[PDB]
């Protein structure tokens, strides 16, 4: 269960694309590194929907080939938003395993092992500082088979060191749909 990061564009391109809402870049992969002119986070594609956090994306539209992709789903209460995935985006599938051995995928393509300790919680096998996880919201929590368990939402930390992760569970992404 390995991962690697690829850069698609710079900041100048990100700003102009943010303005026009028209993105003719080739889309590939399941985890999209998404950005605003100010903030950067992640977006995971599950069943043709590009899912991310509300605290990062807001009610903002997503830059697409035929123009701005309007939000298909907006749950402020669950801190979750979704867009119809842009062409080329490869999709992830919900987990049915019921496996407690989870894996969080970060913006720096690190596959950090998590151990499920509730519906929306999972403990970190090796605690990481809050900075290591910053900008990885919307990132996926994978089962050992590589199926979507949830989307990384918030960090459960004690004085700067993250000991666990809070995530939006796929069941709630299916409930939204």
């Amino acid at each position: 269960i390995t991962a690697y990061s690829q850069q698609t564009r710079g900041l100048l391109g990100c700003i102009i694309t943010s303005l026009t809402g028209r993105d003719k870049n080739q889309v590939e992969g399941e985890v999209q590194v998404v950005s605003t002119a100010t903030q950067s986070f992640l977006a995971t594609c599950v069943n043709g929907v590009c899912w991310t956090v509300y605290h990062g994306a807001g009610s903002k539209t997503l830059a697409g080939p035929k123009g701005p992709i309007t939000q298909m789903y907006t749950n402020v209460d669950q801190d979750l938003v979704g867009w119809q995935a842009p062409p080329g985006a490869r999709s992830l599938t919900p987990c049915t395993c019921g496996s407690s051995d989870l894996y969080l995928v970060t913006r720096h393509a690190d596959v950090i092992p998590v151990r499920r300790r509730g519906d929306s919680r999972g403990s970190l096998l090796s605690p990481r500082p809050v900075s290591y996880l910053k900008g990885s919201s919307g990132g996926p929590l994978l089962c050992p088979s590589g199926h979507a368990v949830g989307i990384f939402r918030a960090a459960v930390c004690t004085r700067g060191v993250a000991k666990a992760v809070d995530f939006v569970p796929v069941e709630s992404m299916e409930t939204t749909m």
């Binding site: 990100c14 999209q32 998404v34 605003t36 991310t52």
Partner: peptide, 12 residues
């Protein structure tokens, strides 16, 4: 403005 794709994470 709109949320922009600026990179990707490819999974094995």
């Amino acid at each position: 403005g709109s949320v922009v794709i600026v990179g990707r994470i490819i999974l094995s």
